[PDB]
RNA sequence: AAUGCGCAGAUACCGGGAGGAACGCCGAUGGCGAAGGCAGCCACCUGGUCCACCCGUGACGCUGAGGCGCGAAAGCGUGGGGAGCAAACCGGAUUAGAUACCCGGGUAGUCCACGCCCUAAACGAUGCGCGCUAGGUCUCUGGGUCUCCUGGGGGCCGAAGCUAACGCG
């Protein structure tokens, strides 16, 4: 297929059960759309700048979802609903590049 | 274009396309948040455009300010 | 999808008339319950109360119900769509998986086949009634009760919709199809979607008959009247308007606000009209 | 009221007026200065001899009142930018640093005829 | 887009022997694959008119094609029409 | 300078909220398109285009009287939206007069779908396709053996030769 991935920034209001309960929703329906997750990394509560709903501070995400085409546009309505989740977009992944050696 | 700095030869293995890494282009949006034109680094074109394009991608996940002060005027 | 005639006659060329592409597999009548004989009649007990009206084709008022709190939880199906003289919009019959069958004024694009449901915990998709405290600010409503238990009265008719404007407190704020905002409780019921039918407003009638086929005798003026009846008349020639515009009964027609200042329901509304 | 003498100062000119003012440095503003207050007609308003004089008139009240330590923000470009931050230390008051303002408008509202002469 | 498996495919489905990348009667049936795809989303857009004049630029090679295939022998030209099913 | 606006609290001052249209530095002597033209970011669906190996077909080519499609802005029919700006129009000033240039207000329209109009300084004021005739200097993009030899696109100075001259080269 492609190379996909994506990047979600969450609310970092989230300690022991929600969570579990929105990282299980996310792989689950992430499975029902159809989606292969192999480098899950997610990299805890950090900083911002500029004050995206008041806080100076939120949660983060990565995954390398593989996902067929048919649906990428609109597998996003499981995120538009959801205000606890800040920040969604998906992009394709390269890396030929590396110069002043 | 004089040279003061010349932050193109001090910094070494670099990555442009990778967005993750701000303590590399934490530099390149100097001081108040307006990328920089080729005459401070000494970029060509190919590099200079995708830079200016991670910049723009990783100035909507926050990380990156791009509208705000300097005090010293 | 209007459709357009051929002038081959001097009243044909004018008049347009709505496609029915929308009415399923459908058209005889539901059985023994739902519809009822209604009455026919232009005045009350004695005397003409409002002028004008009485005449046309015969019509059934079929049971179509509006309060949709007394069966919660149990999903329903949507059987077929048929086409209701009384109203102005397209209804729908919905079957419970219990055995009853009801008609409801159908939403903007509801398809046989699908599912819908009501109840406090319902999920948001065209169809579902939910209470106004669950739903979210910014979307289209139809069918709003005003205080609770009494039934659907606003934004019901051929292509409107309110909208929540936001929460605060108790009360939530309705934008209304007229355009001014009210304040209404938070336990009535409603139902997410527009109503559909949007093209009703967009028919030419053509000729003088298919406005009588409908229930409306002919308007004469009040300039062409004596004085002994309209305020308006006399006038050997053809008088000019007379000292200003009246009503047979005596009040003003131009400008003359009517709504009682000492009613109890001016502490709910902003008025924005 | 002679509350604590941190403060905050917001000026600016447009073209042809100045006024300042002083703020509570988490809230609301105390006093402030034009030039209206000062006595002048049109022109001999935006001029670059009556800054100093609105910034010395805002002295006598951040004086009577408790205000020693001040910030000072400048908001576009005119005549009695360049006066009134010299104008501070004529008072002394314990000036600190320079900040910016104004922001560019992003691509905004269309501008009127007046700045269309530029095309 | 256009994959690699029905570019593979359709080269041995109309070659003569087992060989060749390309001749006068593939070439055809290579642009007739892509009018009959590239047709049909046209019917849902209808507004891009770069992609009707590309449309239009490759209708006047593939029928300048079957111009010159007559030009041979017509039986080996009527073997195409009716294996392609292109203009009854 | 006035017409307007404000002491029933205006201008500027702080934090939330609704709401359109336009997208700052990057940016230029830059790129893309057959021409009109096109700049926030994300994915979807698609035409055109230059280079490397040089694999197979085998002259299939170039130009086109009428036909068909595209065609900035203003303008017109049918419904949605309206913040700013703003033809007509009422004021203030200027002037011998000022139906105008300057200031305060102000609708259609500018915006979105669908159907038509079809004009221009639609300008390199230069039909289209190919072959031959010394070279400098910067810049854009590929294959490389990347003090440079090579295949193309974008500028400025110059051989022979051309033109009534300016000049293209
Ligand atoms: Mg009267």
Redesign the pocket.
């Known amino acids: 297929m492609?190379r996909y991935e994506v990047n979600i920034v969450l609310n970092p209001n989230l300690d022991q059960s929600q969570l579990a309960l929105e990282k299980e929703i996310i792989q689950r329906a992430l499975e029902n759309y159809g989606a292969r997750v192999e480098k899950v990394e997610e990299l805890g509560l950090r900083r911002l700048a500029y004050?995206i709903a008041?806080d100076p501070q939120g949660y983060f995400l990565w995954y390398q979802v593989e996902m067929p085409?048919d649906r990428?546009?609109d597998l996003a309505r499981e995120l538009r609903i959801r205000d606890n989740v800040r920040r969604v977009?998906?992009?394709?992944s390269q890396e030929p590049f590396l110069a002043n050696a | 274009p004089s040279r003061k700095a010349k932050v193109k030869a001090t910094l070494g293995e670099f990555d442009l396309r990778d967005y993750r890494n701000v303590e590399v282009l934490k530099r390149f949006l100097s001081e108040?948040?307006?990328?920089?034109?080729?005459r401070r680094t000494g970029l060509?074109?190919?590099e200079?455009?995708i830079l200016?394009?991670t910049i723009?991608?990783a100035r909507?996940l926050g990380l990156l300010p791009?509208?705000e002060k300097l005090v010293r005027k | 999808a209007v459709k357009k005639f051929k002038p081959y006659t001097p009243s044909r060329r004018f008049m347009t008339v709505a496609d029915f592409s929308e009415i399923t597999k459908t058209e005889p009548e539901k059985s023994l319950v739902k519809p009822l004989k209604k009455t026919g009649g232009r005045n009350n007990q004695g005397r003409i109360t409002v002028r004008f009206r009485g005449g046309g084709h015969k019509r059934l008022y079929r049971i179509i119900d509006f309060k949709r709190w007394d069966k919660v939880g149990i999903p329903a199906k949507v059987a077929a769509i048929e086409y209701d003289p009384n109203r102005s919009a397209r209804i729908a019959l919905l079957h419970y998986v219990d055995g009853e069958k009801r008609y409801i004024i159908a939403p903007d694009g509801l398809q046989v086949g699908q599912q819908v449901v009501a109840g406090p915990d319902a999920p948001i998709q065209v169809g579902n009634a939910l209470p106004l405290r669950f739903i979210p600010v910014?979307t289209v409503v139809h069918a709003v009760e005003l205080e609770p238990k009494k039934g659907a009265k606003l934004a019901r008719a051929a292509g409107t919709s309110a909208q929540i404007q936001?929460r605060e407190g108790d009360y939530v704020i309705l934008r209304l199809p007229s355009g001014e905002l009210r304040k209404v409780h938070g336990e009535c019921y409603a139902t997410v979607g527009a109503v559909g039918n949007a093209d009703h407003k967009?028919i030419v009638l053509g000729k003088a008959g298919r406005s009588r086929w409908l229930g409306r005798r002919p308007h004469v003026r009040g300039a062409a009247m004596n004085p002994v009846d309209h305020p308006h008349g006399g006038g050997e020639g053809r008088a000019p308007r007379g000292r200003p515009p009246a009503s047979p009964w005596g009040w003003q027609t131009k400008g003359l606000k009517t709504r009682k200042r000492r009613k109890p329901s001016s502490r709910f509304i902003i008025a924005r009209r | 009221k002679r509350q604590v003498a941190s403060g905050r100062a917001?000026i600016?000119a447009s073209y042809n007026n100045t006024?300042v003012?002083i703020?509570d440095p988490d809230?609301?503003?105390i006093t402030?200065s034009?030039g209206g207050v000062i006595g002048y007609?049109?022109?001999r308003k935006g001029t670059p001899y009556a800054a100093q004089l609105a910034a010395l008139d805002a002295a006598k009240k951040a004086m009577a009142y408790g205000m020693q330590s001040v910030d000072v923000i400048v908001?576009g470009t005119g005549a009695g930018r360049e006066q009134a931050i010299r104008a501070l230390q004529a008072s002394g008051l314990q000036v600190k640093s320079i900040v910016d303002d104004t922001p560019?408008p992003?691509?905004?509202?269309?501008?009127?005829?007046?700045f269309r002469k530029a095309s | 887009?256009?994959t690699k498996e029905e570019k593979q495919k359709v080269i041995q489905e109309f070659a003569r022997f087992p060989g060749?990348?390309?001749?006068?009667e593939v070439?055809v049936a290579l642009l007739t694959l892509?009018i009959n795809?590239?047709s049909e989303?046209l019917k849902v857009h209808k507004?891009?008119?770069?992609?009707?004049?590309?449309?239009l630029?490759?209708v006047g090679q593939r029928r300048?094609?079957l111009?010159?295939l007559q030009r041979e022998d017509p039986e080996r030209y009527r073997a195409l029409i009716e294996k392609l099913g292109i203009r009854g």
């Open positions: 492609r004050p008041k085409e990428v546009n977009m998906v992009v394709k | 108040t948040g307006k990328i920089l034109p080729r060509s074109g190919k200079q455009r200016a394009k723009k991608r909507i791009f509208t | 910014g936001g967009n | 917001y600016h006024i003012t703020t809230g609301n503003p402030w034009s007609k049109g022109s908001r560019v992003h691509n905004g509202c269309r501008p009127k005829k007046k | 887009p256009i060749d990348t390309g001749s006068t070439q892509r795809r590239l989303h507004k891009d008119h770069h992609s009707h004049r590309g449309l630029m490759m300048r094609l111009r010159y």
